[PDB]
């Protein structure tokens, strides 16, 4: 169980269910998951890869609520970045010059 769907279990749930075909476990056995991130829009204005997530932000983490205040996606995108600077077991791996077929995602490795 969990106290309030922390980001750890929130990511294990998103991936376990497969919310996006670009984000998933490359080796969930050792807790290794890679994300696609942005590969087209300089930043947003089109991120179907992380579009259904970027929204869960605010209403999720707990920094905003629709139907009460105004929405602000600017800071929401800054949160995802911290999601990588968090959990002291993640290892961002966007491949260098070996695993570069035609996507190259930020493969984050989580230690068990």
Curated annotation (Swiss-Prot):
It is found in: Nucleus. Induction: By viruses and IFN. The keyword Magnesium does not apply. The keyword Transcription regulation applies. One of its GO terms (cellular component) is nucleoplasm. It comes from the Eukaryota. Residues 4-112 bind DNA. Acetylated by CBP/ p300 during cell-growth. Acetylation on Lys-74 is required for stimulation of H4 promoter activity. Sumoylation with SUMO1 increases its transcriptional repressor activity on IRF1 and diminishes its ability to activate ISRE and H4 promoter. The modification N6-acetyllysine is found at residues 74, 77. One of its GO terms (molecular function) is DNA-binding transcription activator activity, RNA polymerase II-specific. Coiled coil: none annotated. GO terms for biological process: defense response to virus; regulation of transcription by RNA polymerase II; toll-like receptor 3 signaling pathway. Specifically binds to the upstream regulatory region of type I IFN and IFN-inducible MHC class I genes (the interferon consensus sequence (ICS)) and represses those genes. Also acts as an activator for several genes including H4 and IL7. Constitutively binds to the ISRE promoter to activate IL7. Involved in cell cycle regulation through binding the site II (HiNF-M) promoter region of H4 and activating transcription during cell growth. Antagonizes IRF1 transcriptional activation. Belongs to the IRF family. This is Interferon regulatory factor 2. It comes from Mus musculus. The lineage of its organism: Eukaryota, Metazoa, Chordata, Craniata, Vertebrata. The chain holds residues 2 to 113 of 349 of the full protein.
């Amino acid at each position: 169980p969990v106290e309030r769907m922390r980001m750890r279990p929130w990511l294990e749930e998103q991936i376990n269910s497969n919310t996006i075909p670009g984000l998933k476990w490359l080796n969930k056995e050792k807790k290794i998951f890679q994300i696609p991130w942005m590969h087209a829009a300089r930043h947003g204005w089109d991120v179907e890869k992380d579009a259904p997530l970027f929204r869960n932000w605010a209403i999720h983490t707990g920094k905003h609520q629709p139907g009460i205040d105004k929405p602000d996606p600017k800071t929401w995108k800054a949160n995802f970045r911290c999601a990588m600077n968090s959990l002291p077991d993640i290892e961002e791996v966007k491949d260098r010059s070996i695993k570069k077929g035609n996507n190259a995602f930020r493969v984050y490795r989580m230690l068990p």
